Each structure stands twice: as structure tokens, then as C-alpha cells.
Amino acid sequence: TPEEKLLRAIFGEKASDVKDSSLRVPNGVSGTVIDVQVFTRDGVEKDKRA
Amino acid sequence: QDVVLGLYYMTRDCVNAKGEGMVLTGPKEAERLYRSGLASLHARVKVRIT
Amino acid sequence: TEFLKPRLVDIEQVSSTHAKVTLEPLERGFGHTLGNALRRILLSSMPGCAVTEVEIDGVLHEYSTKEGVQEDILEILLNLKGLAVRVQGKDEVILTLNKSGIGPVTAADITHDGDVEIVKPQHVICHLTDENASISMRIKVQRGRGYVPASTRIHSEEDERPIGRLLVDACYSPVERIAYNVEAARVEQRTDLDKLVIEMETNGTIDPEEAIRRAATILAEQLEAFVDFDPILLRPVDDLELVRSANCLKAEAIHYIGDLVQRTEVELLKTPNLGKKSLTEIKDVLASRGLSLGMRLENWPPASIADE
Amino acid sequence: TEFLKPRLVDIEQVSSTHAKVTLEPLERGFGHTLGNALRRILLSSMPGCAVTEVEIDGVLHEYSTKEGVQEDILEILLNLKGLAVRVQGKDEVILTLNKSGIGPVTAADITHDGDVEIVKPQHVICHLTDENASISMRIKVQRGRGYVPASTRIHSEEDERPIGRLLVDACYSPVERIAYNVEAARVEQRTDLDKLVIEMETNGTIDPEEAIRRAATILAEQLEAFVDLRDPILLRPVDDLELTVRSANCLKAEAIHYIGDLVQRTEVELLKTPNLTEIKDVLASRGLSLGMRLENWPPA
Amino acid sequence: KPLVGTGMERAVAVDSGVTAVAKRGGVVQYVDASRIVIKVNEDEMYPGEAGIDIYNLTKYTRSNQNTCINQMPCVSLGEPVERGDVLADGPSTDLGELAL
Amino acid sequence: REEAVVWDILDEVIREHPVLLNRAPTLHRLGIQAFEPVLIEGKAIQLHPLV
Amino acid sequence: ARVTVQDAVEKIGNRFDLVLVAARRARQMQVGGKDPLVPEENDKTTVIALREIEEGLINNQILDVRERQEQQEQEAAEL
């Protein structure tokens, strides 16, 4: 919309083709993380943490 | 249920406690008495009300 | 140990015998404490003078009657309990009470001296029915604290008193009825602490606020062995009710108070229009208007500029 | 009047956990005054030294397990609440603990300090079982009154600690449980006179004499409420003026950051630059001038 | 443990499939907060195997209802152990008895 | 962020602001009654003993 | 007032018009920019209107006179 397009025009801000779907804590929960477990698909590459 | 016991305990007529039939001048000084331990709750007296 | 001492905020006094004295805030566990720890003082341990002994002529006991009197002897004994008194310097005063006339017997009828102080003179002690009979009694005043009724008083007075001498339940303490409470109090993140609300009504012969001073001393004295812009400032020098501070400032291109306060009186007075007597007409201006030597002005000049 | 002021009299110290204090003289009813009103104050507001932050190497969180230890790790933090340690001067001491081989790590396994007085060194902290078991913790000890849980410290401090700093709630209150009685005191001419025994039973770390000396110190100060009481322009930068392209080519050539730095100079200190009526137009509008000297600048 | 019991606990806590039942006995050789090594009694023993038993306890792991199932040891170092014992407790169990 | 003034702006609003409290099954006309709040710090709802 | 509406329905006589005389009245301070006539007492306007009724200065009729005379000070003001 042309208001935001003008906000793009002032500051040159370029929000990319990337969109957020981050898994977050349900708000109102305290505690401590006791495991991270990874299930990767077959044949597909693996990363430095897993 | 709770108050209806405590009202019944408050207003009662036990013939024996202390100060049977003594004189009083006001319900203020009636509460001078029970809060001092120098009388009881349920014991008959001779009073004045307005 | 960084304890939250309180400040008393308020007294809500109704009349000259009554008050509600609130408070905030305390910690939890001291609000319930103090509001009880004073109530054990105002019942049993506040020293005052009260009516103790009663002597009427022509009587035998209080179950009897007296003609010429509307009431019973007990109701006349009742009134002296509701009577208020103050003996100043003595420690045992005896008074008298003799009347005639058709009507009531108010508390002016006591033959007093200057050291016994009745606060309530309208207090009726008897009613004469017809003109014929009359009341002539003698009453006795003693000093103590708290309350002792005549039941256990005669258990503690083993005197074989002769017939005609009566004894009332003495009212030594001045507190008639007090009560207290605990609501919640807040400090702007902690909404857990407790205020103190105290309701208090006493008799006369005292201030209703004087007791909480007086009685809370006594608990503490027990513990001493245990703690051991302006409008004419928008206006040039010709209109400020003065005239040798007007004509000689505009000839240095300061037509107003504006650059007068920034510029220094060692040079502005050194110009050929002011001098060593102008400081009485600048520094006295800067006394009431507060501006300084060299000050930065927030918003001095409007669009209007003019002269005379 | 006929008042009578009390004296501290007796310290019949039965144990290092169990004690008794007598008290006299007391008048009628004032036994229930000073038997009661200490007790509510005594049970809450006594400052003690208690364990707060136990931290072990090689254990990431309170739900981890370490080998050679017979116990689960949260339970060892629950063991570490029951520690009576008498510290005198400061408010923060970081004890250290080591052991090796089979044998229960008890409370006698600390490298002691000078003002540190462990009360109960016989207390069991752990039970190492393996030969290569060698536990090592880095415990913060504090000094406080009242109750603090773990979650209270969390929100109150936004500063982020390193990982592995396993908290324990703050049970500070070094009293356990008291009782008292009202009996008669034998003074001859005043036979109504009454005495007061205050049995105090607690843990270590507290001499029971000073427990009440501080307790009246709490109460007698809350009666003192009763025995007494009944330019934006100056910090504005250079680009706000919509100023001329020739003179903004010069004020950025004369190296001035704020307008307070500009009026730190005078009108004479601008004329030497190539390419005064404009500033004499605009400064006279919004409440400014030139030639004004600033001192105690900058205020950051 | 509960103070007014009903004599049913050490049958219902045992046969609940949550503790460790001593199929064989012996003395506790190695005891840990992770697992228990016990050595088979020699009158209980067999000529084939050596006769050393290990039970790996199941530590902090979820339940279906989002609760914790951790089994806890309760035995001591170097102690005689009968058959059919409560070697390591369940979560809500205390020394073989239900402790709700 | 649960910031500082957030409470004391809310604290002005809920003063003299009514509210409803309803219990199912609201079996007669008094099963849904208006109330006025007095804000406590906690996680459950405190009710008057004569309602 | 703050707790009941008895002392204002002694004046109005109905459990719904006291809402309706103040449904009309309590908009003039939300978006009408006006001020009440009683001491304000930091009050939200659904009882500030209820104060103005139960202080006897407002029924439905007396609201209708201040809304008439506002229009005849805009009608000839244009001309």
C-alpha cells in the first residue's frame, strides 16, 4: 500500500522473501530445557549441531 | 453455614459462666468486657439500650 | 534489615470523643501485631480517676426504693458509671450532691473544688418527682487503671463497711470502645502488604488522639531495657513603575530586558548611558525575576518590535 | 503510678538447638503483651545466613545426572537447604568443596574461611559411591531475612547469568519454633507479679540472647510513628532548521555538532568561510540570539 | 509413607510394573543413581552364564499426561538383597509402598 | 514487556468499570450478575460469601 | 450511584429509562468534550450521568431543553 511504499521510499528498507514461523514458548510458562532431539530425513544433508 | 453457627454461638443463654445478672450501661462496654476476659459472651445481665 | 517504617497519614475524627486513625503501609506480620498489641493497653492499663464509693443518707441497699425519685437506685448507680471526671493533683477526693426542685439533677449540683474536673455538666444523676423529697448523697473518687467491677472488688475489699455505703464498677481507663482492622496496601510492584485501620471512641476528659500517643509510650517504655513568567517582564523599561532605568538602555541596541540579562554590567554600565548607580536598578530587577549574568533565554522575541 | 520495668535475667542454654529465656518483672496482662508480641516478630524477621546458589562443573541443569553420586541432583539441592553457617561480617561468601573415592560428602568437606562458622559439619550433603567419584561445587552463601523463592530473583534481575548456576530458594529464617508460659514472680510486697519463660528452639547460627534484643529493636521503632505522630532547543542538532545549502556547506566545514556548540562560538567565528542576515532572521523567531557564553558544558 | 494404611500397598505397588523386582538376589556390588549392578546368588546361579545382573533405571522422561517418571534407587552399598525385593522405587512409591 | 506505567494506567481504568460473572448452568435470572472488580495479584477468582 | 440505583429510580420510576436518560447523557463527556455539573470525583461517566440524575437536576424532560436551545443558536447563526 502506498503509505508503506513511501515508508519504503524514505528509508530504503527492503524486507526480503523470508517470512517468520518461529517456534516460541507459550507465554506464561517458566522452566528449563532438558533435551533437544533431531529427526532428519533420509539421504538429506545434516548440520553442525545434530 | 459458617456464620449461622457463629451467630447461634454468639447469642446464647448459659446459666453458669460469670457475671450472672450484673449491671451494664452500654453495648460498647459489653465489648469492653468480653475482650478483657472479665466476662463471657453468653451470660444474662441487666442493661440499657437506646 | 531495611525495615519499612510507616508514616501516619490521617485521622478521621467525627466529634470530640471519636476518631478513625488509618495508616499505610506495614509489613505482613506487624499489622495484625500492633493493632492487637495496643488493644491490651487501652483495656487494662490506662491510668485515670473514677467513681468508686457511694454514700447516700437514709439508704440500706440498692434493691430498695426512694420516694420523690423516678428511678431505681441501680439506675442512679448506672449514671455515675456514665459520668466523666478528672482529679488533677490529689489521689482521693470525695464529693457531695444536694438538690431541691421539680425536675432533673444535672452534674452542676456537685460541690467541687478546683482540682476535680467534670467535662459533662448536663449529666443527670437523679430526677426529683415532686418538690417535697430531695437527694443528698456523697460519692468517692479513686485513681487506677483499667476496670474492676464491684463483684471482685468486694472480694478484694474485706472491709466490713457499715450499711449505707455503696460501690460501683469503676471506669479507670478512658477508652469506651476501640476496634481495628487490616486491609491490603500497595507499593507499586508489591501489592501484598497491609495497611492499618483503627477505629477509636473514648469518653471525655481526654483527646481521642492523645491516647495513641500516651498508651503506645507505655508499651515502648516496657522495652527500653530490651532495646538497650511575568506580564511586565514582557514589557520595556518605560512601563515598570519606576524613571532612571528607562531612557538609557535602548541606546546600546537593547530596547528591552532581553540582552540586558546576558550582557555584563561591567560594560553595559561602562557605555555612555549607564554607570555605577544602575546596578540598583538591574540587580534588584534580577532579584524578583531570577535571571542571571549571561543567561540563556528560552523564548524571548515575538514578532512585535517597536519603540516610543 | 506504680509501674515496673523488666530486666533480662536468665540464659538457660539447654543445647545448641534448644534454649530457654526467663523474663521479669511483668505486671498483670503484660505477660500476654510481651509473651505474644515478640513471637510474631520473632518468627519472621531474624536475619540469617543461608545457601543460595550451588553450582557444579560438568552438570548443566538441575535435571541432569552425574555418575559416582548416589543421589539425584535436585535432591542434593534439597539437601543443601539444611545448612547452618554462622558468618559474621560480610554478606556474600563463596565456599568450595572437594572429595574423592567412595564416601559420603558431608558438611565437613569445605575449605573454611575465617568469619565462616559452620554450625553443623556432620550433616550429610551427598553419598559418593564410585572410586573415581570426585564432586566439586561452587556455592554462594548469602545473608538475609524473609523468604525469597527462585522465581523472585529471575524477574527482578534482567542480567543474564552463565549456564549451570543452579538456584535454590532462600529459606533465611533461622528460628524454628517457640513457646512460652505465664507464671508468677516472687516479689514480696507485690504478690501479683508474674514471670515469663520464653523457650526458644531453633537451628544454630543464633545466640538466643541477641534474638530478642533485635526483636524489640524491630518493635520499638514502629512506635515512633505513634509516640511522635499522634531546555530542548539547546540539545537540538544541525539539520532541523531546513537551512540553506550554501551555509550548511559551511557549518559542516566549521565542525560544529550541536547548536550549543554553535553558540559556544560567536558570530565573528563564522565569517572566514566562502560560498549573517539569515541567522539574524531565524534566531530571533524561536527564542535564540548569538553571543551567549556556556559553562559546565557538555552535560552529555 | 502414609500413617493409616490398609495392607494393600506392597502388593499393588510391586505388581504395577514401575519398580524393580529381584528375579534373583545376592549382594549389591555396584550401586549408582543411574543403574544397579547386582551379583547373582550362587545357589541361585547357573553353570552357563557368569551371573552378574544389571538393571538400567529410566531417568527423567515424560509421561502421557505431562508428568515425570523417574525411578529412584533405594538400596545401599554392599548389602544383602532377597529375591522379589523392591530394588529401585517408582516415582510415587516409597520403599515399596504407595505414597500418593 | 510488563512495563512500569502499564499497571497504573490499567488501575485507573478498572476503577468504576463494571464486569459480568456467569456460572453455567445459569439456571435462573441471578445466574449472571454484574460485578465491579478490585484487582488482586494471583491466578484465581475470589467471590463474595453471600453470592 | 457507585453501589445501587435505588435513589435514582425513586426519581425516574423505571429500571430502564435511568439507563436511557443516561445513555443519552453520558456521551457528552466521552466525545462531546463537556464537563459535568456535580463535583467530578474522578468518576467514569456512566455514574457521573447517574450523579446528575439523582441530584434532582435531571429527568428526561430537562435534558430535552438544553438540546433544543443548542439548535436555535446554530440556526440563525448561519443566516
Side-chain angles (χ1 to χ4, degrees), chain A, chain B, chain C residues 1-232 234-299 301-308, chain D, chain E, chain F, chain G:
Chain A
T1 52
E3 306 97 2
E4 280 95 305
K5 192 162 290 300
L6 184 50
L7 282 178
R8 195 138 307 179
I10 297 152
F11 307 93
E13 187 71 277
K14 183 57 65 67
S16 172
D17 207 66
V18 296
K19 167 68 178 305
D20 199 84
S21 309
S22 155
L23 169 75
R24 296 175 231 272
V25 175
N27 171 71
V29 164
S30 179
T32 315
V33 171
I34 64 177
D35 170 79
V36 182
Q37 191 94 48
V38 165
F39 291 82
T40 325
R41 217 178 45 190
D42 218 351
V44 188
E45 49 86 28
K46 274 173 188 207
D47 45 6
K48 186 178 304 218
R49 191 212 177 88
Chain B
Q1 46 186 0
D2 264 331
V3 280
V4 78
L5 172 70
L7 262 298
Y8 167 63
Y9 202 88
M10 167 196 292
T11 59
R12 205 192 179 281
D13 42 0
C14 195
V15 305
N16 74 337
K18 62 194 288 192
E20 207 89 1
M22 51 176 36
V23 71
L24 268 84
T25 196
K28 280 148 299 289
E29 87 151 353
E31 211 198 345
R32 284 187 72 195
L33 259 183
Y34 158 73
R35 301 306 300 174
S36 177
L38 286 169
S40 68
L41 303 155
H42 45 64
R44 49 198 60 97
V45 285
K46 312 152 173 279
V47 295
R48 176 193 329 163
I49 70 182
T50 168
Chain C
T1 295
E2 296 89 36
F3 275 95
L4 201 146
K5 311 185 306 294
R7 73 276 186 184
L8 201 81
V9 288
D10 193 14
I11 315 164
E12 195 199 314
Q13 162 192 342
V14 168
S15 72
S16 163
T17 46
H18 190 109
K20 313 154 199 215
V21 194
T22 180
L23 178 52
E24 48 182 323
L26 299 192
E27 307 281 296
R28 56 94 173 170
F30 309 102
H32 287 273
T33 285
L34 298 171
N36 197 70
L38 311 180
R39 205 182 34 91
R40 322 292 284 153
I41 322 169
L42 290 179
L43 294 201
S44 190
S45 283
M46 291 309 288
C49 269
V51 179
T52 295
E53 292 278 344
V54 160
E55 173 185 33
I56 325 170
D57 79 309
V59 305
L60 67 158
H61 51 67
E62 67 273 356
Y63 291 119
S64 44
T65 56
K66 177 179 174 315
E67 197 36 75
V69 168
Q70 286 172 354
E71 307 98 12
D72 194 38
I73 309 170
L74 284 158
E75 295 182 357
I76 295 156
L77 262 183
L78 264 168
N79 282 269
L80 300 166
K81 192 196 298 195
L83 171 56
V85 82
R86 176 198 289 160
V87 162
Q88 193 268 338
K90 279 194 64 213
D91 215 350
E92 183 161 305
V93 186
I94 306 198
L95 311 159
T96 45
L97 185 82
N98 313 313
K99 205 44 175 50
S100 44
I102 299 103
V105 190
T106 49
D109 203 39
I110 292 192
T111 77
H112 70 286
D113 48 350
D115 56 78
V116 50
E117 316 308 308
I118 283 170
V119 71
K120 181 185 280 178
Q122 63 268 13
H123 175 60
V124 60
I125 319 170
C126 203
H127 283 88
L128 293 183
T129 66
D130 57 349
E131 176 63 35
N132 198 340
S134 166
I135 180 61
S136 274
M137 78 167 49
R138 293 207 285 265
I139 47 184
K140 195 192 292 165
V141 172
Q142 213 182 318
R143 171 68 58 87
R145 45 193 187 274
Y147 198 109
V148 166
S151 59
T152 173
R153 178 58 70 181
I154 210 59
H155 304 339
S156 88
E157 274 293 316
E158 282 173 19
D159 44 350
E160 36 175 354
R161 56 177 178 172
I163 182 164
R165 302 179 52 94
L166 285 188
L167 165 70
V168 77
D169 307 355
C171 186
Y172 276 147
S173 201
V175 158
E176 270 295 325
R177 208 197 63 115
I178 55 157
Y180 78 107
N181 277 316
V182 161
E183 296 194 20
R186 46 207 309 270
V187 171
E188 75 278 342
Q189 60 276 64
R190 308 142 50 205
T191 306
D192 49 357
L193 288 193
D194 45 348
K195 85 176 300 210
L196 177 51
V197 189
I198 310 163
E199 187 266 309
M200 166 169 295
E201 175 199 14
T202 67
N203 44 23
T205 71
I206 204 171
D207 222 13
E209 311 95 321
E210 203 198 10
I212 313 166
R213 173 173 292 116
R214 175 176 292 244
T217 299
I218 313 169
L219 174 85
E221 297 282 333
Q222 286 283 331
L223 297 169
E224 293 173 339
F226 286 145
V227 290
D228 266 343
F229 182 74
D230 288 299
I232 69 167
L234 207 61
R235 172 168 275 232
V237 277
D238 50 328
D239 293 280
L240 258 66
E241 306 152 298
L242 288 168
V243 73
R244 207 247 170 271
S245 199
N247 43 11
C248 274
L249 165 62
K250 302 188 183 301
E252 289 101 10
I254 313 109
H255 308 87
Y256 176 76
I257 204 165
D259 199 68
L260 161 65
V261 299
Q262 163 62 245
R263 216 189 280 248
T264 305
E265 287 144 48
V266 80
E267 188 182 58
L268 182 91
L269 266 56
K270 207 182 54 192
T271 65
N273 285 293
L274 298 199
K276 299 293 288 297
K277 291 323 186 269
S278 275
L279 182 135
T280 303
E281 269 78 5
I282 307 177
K283 281 270 289 196
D284 278 322
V285 178
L286 287 201
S288 69
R289 300 317 197 214
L291 294 89
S292 90
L293 176 81
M295 204 189 150
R296 288 190 303 276
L297 275 159
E298 321 301 304
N299 225 336
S304 181
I305 46 183
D307 213 337
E308 87 158 0
Chain D
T1 182
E2 311 279 355
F3 286 129
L4 205 58
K5 258 56 190 183
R7 310 293 145 201
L8 185 47
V9 165
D10 194 293
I11 316 159
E12 189 181 0
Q13 176 60 276
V14 190
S15 171
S16 201
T17 43
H18 202 175
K20 275 225 181 190
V21 166
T22 87
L23 218 54
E24 62 189 2
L26 273 167
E27 314 207 305
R28 291 213 309 270
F30 273 92
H32 286 303
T33 315
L34 297 181
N36 187 16
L38 311 182
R39 153 172 158 91
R40 301 177 33 88
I41 297 188
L42 264 189
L43 265 182
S44 297
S45 280
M46 299 316 286
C49 289
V51 177
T52 309
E53 316 179 1
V54 189
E55 159 192 9
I56 313 192
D57 54 84
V59 167
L60 278 190
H61 49 96
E62 58 207 21
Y63 311 103
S64 297
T65 67
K66 188 172 147 184
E67 293 85 10
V69 180
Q70 270 187 352
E71 273 68 68
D72 296 312
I73 287 185
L74 269 164
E75 194 272 343
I76 302 150
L77 299 165
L78 265 290
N79 271 306
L80 257 159
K81 299 175 132 181
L83 265 299
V85 281
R86 194 178 291 188
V87 185
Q88 294 180 353
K90 61 178 69 180
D91 302 298
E92 172 168 10
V93 54
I94 310 166
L95 306 188
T96 41
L97 172 138
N98 295 273
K99 194 69 214 57
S100 157
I102 318 167
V105 189
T106 47
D109 299 312
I110 324 175
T111 61
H112 84 294
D113 204 73
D115 48 329
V116 164
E117 288 182 2
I118 314 156
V119 170
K120 187 199 187 310
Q122 65 179 4
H123 177 46
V124 190
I125 310 187
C126 176
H127 265 86
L128 289 184
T129 175
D130 209 316
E131 216 282 326
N132 288 317
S134 69
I135 208 168
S136 43
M137 53 205 53
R138 214 197 71 201
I139 308 182
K140 162 162 317 190
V141 190
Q142 298 181 342
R143 160 153 285 215
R145 88 155 200 255
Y147 182 68
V148 180
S151 196
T152 281
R153 195 147 312 277
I154 302 303
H155 149 71
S156 55
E157 177 175 351
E158 80 282 337
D159 177 37
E160 38 195 1
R161 61 200 206 278
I163 58 153
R165 281 171 57 81
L166 325 181
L167 266 60
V168 174
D169 313 305
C171 58
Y172 286 147
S173 318
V175 191
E176 279 274 4
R177 166 203 67 82
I178 63 189
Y180 64 98
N181 285 319
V182 185
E183 302 95 306
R186 209 57 200 92
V187 164
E188 310 91 351
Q189 69 271 69
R190 298 272 270 243
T191 41
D192 64 339
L193 285 196
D194 305 313
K195 53 172 60 189
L196 157 71
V197 44
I198 308 195
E199 157 171 291
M200 180 186 294
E201 191 269 333
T202 173
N203 52 280
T205 316
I206 285 301
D207 73 293
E209 194 268 347
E210 200 37 52
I212 305 111
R213 290 281 172 86
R214 288 144 155 175
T217 307
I218 288 169
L219 158 57
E221 301 275 10
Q222 321 306 319
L223 294 158
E224 275 187 5
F226 296 154
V227 295
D228 299 85
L229 194 59
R230 270 81 69 199
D231 184 43
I233 321 183
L234 180 55
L235 66 101
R236 192 78 34 85
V238 295
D239 73 272
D240 308 271
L241 318 181
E242 286 283 327
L243 72 164
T244 71
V245 193
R246 321 291 297 278
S247 172
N249 213 6
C250 304
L251 286 162
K252 298 301 290 292
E254 299 151 307
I256 290 186
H257 291 258
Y258 295 124
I259 202 187
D261 190 78
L262 175 46
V263 70
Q264 188 179 1
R265 302 258 263 185
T266 44
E267 189 266 355
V268 175
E269 284 151 294
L270 280 62
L271 198 83
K272 66 161 289 290
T273 54
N275 196 59
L276 69 153
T277 78
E278 42 185 350
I279 48 183
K280 280 165 168 79
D281 271 317
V282 185
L283 293 165
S285 159
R286 325 191 60 147
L288 286 149
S289 43
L290 269 194
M292 326 167 74
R293 55 156 74 85
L294 300 90
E295 274 306 316
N296 283 167
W297 169 274
Chain E
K1 39 160 186 78
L3 301 156
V4 196
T6 327
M8 207 45 185
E9 288 89 3
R10 222 183 301 276
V12 72
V14 164
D15 297 294
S16 45
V18 84
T19 64
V21 186
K23 304 181 301 299
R24 329 171 193 288
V27 193
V28 176
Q29 178 196 294
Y30 185 67
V31 52
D32 212 345
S34 81
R35 65 196 183 195
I36 295 97
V37 178
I38 201 164
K39 177 159 169 53
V40 181
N41 264 325
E42 277 59 30
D43 59 278
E44 288 177 339
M45 217 194 76
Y46 306 88
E49 88 269 15
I52 290 168
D53 266 337
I54 167 64
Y55 312 99
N56 297 341
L57 295 195
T58 52
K59 298 307 287 191
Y60 286 143
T61 317
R62 211 181 51 102
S63 64
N64 289 283
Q65 273 81 346
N66 297 325
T67 68
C68 188
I69 322 180
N70 186 11
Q71 320 196 13
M72 303 159 67
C74 62
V75 282
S76 315
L77 178 61
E79 74 160 338
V81 164
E82 211 187 9
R83 203 182 163 141
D85 273 336
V86 188
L87 315 173
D89 283 13
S92 81
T93 79
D94 185 72
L95 304 194
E97 321 182 48
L98 191 53
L100 291 185
Chain F
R1 266 176 280 171
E2 196 67 273
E3 277 177 63
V5 300
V6 174
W7 295 114
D8 269 5
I9 296 155
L10 177 51
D11 188 87
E12 289 153 2
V13 169
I14 204 168
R15 189 205 73 253
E16 315 320 300
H17 210 172
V19 79
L20 302 199
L21 284 180
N22 189 9
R23 178 165 192 274
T26 164
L27 272 153
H28 65 308
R29 201 198 58 178
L30 311 179
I32 167 162
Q33 308 200 342
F35 263 106
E36 175 261 353
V38 277
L39 273 178
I40 76 177
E41 173 81 45
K43 280 172 190 171
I45 315 173
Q46 307 176 307
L47 275 62
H48 186 259
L50 272 172
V51 210
Chain G
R2 188 181 195 176
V3 284
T4 54
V5 286
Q6 167 98 356
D7 50 307
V9 295
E10 295 299 326
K11 182 73 64 200
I12 298 310
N14 191 65
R15 295 301 183 178
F16 312 102
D17 181 52
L18 184 71
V19 182
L20 284 176
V21 300
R24 164 188 220 161
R25 173 67 186 113
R27 284 294 189 92
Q28 276 180 328
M29 294 135 282
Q30 180 82 58
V31 286
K34 307 184 180 61
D35 193 288
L37 317 180
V38 73
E40 277 202 356
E41 214 184 12
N42 214 12
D43 181 33
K44 217 172 285 200
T45 178
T46 55
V47 197
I48 268 290
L50 182 46
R51 200 71 83 180
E52 292 157 355
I53 308 148
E54 83 187 16
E55 68 202 46
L57 283 97
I58 294 200
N59 268 30
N60 209 306
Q61 186 263 3
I62 323 154
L63 300 154
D64 278 297
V65 202
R66 281 168 180 175
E67 303 213 272
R68 282 189 295 272
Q69 71 193 235
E70 193 161 344
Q71 313 311 100
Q72 68 171 332
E73 299 206 323
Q74 203 98 25
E75 264 148 7
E78 182 149 349
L79 269 298

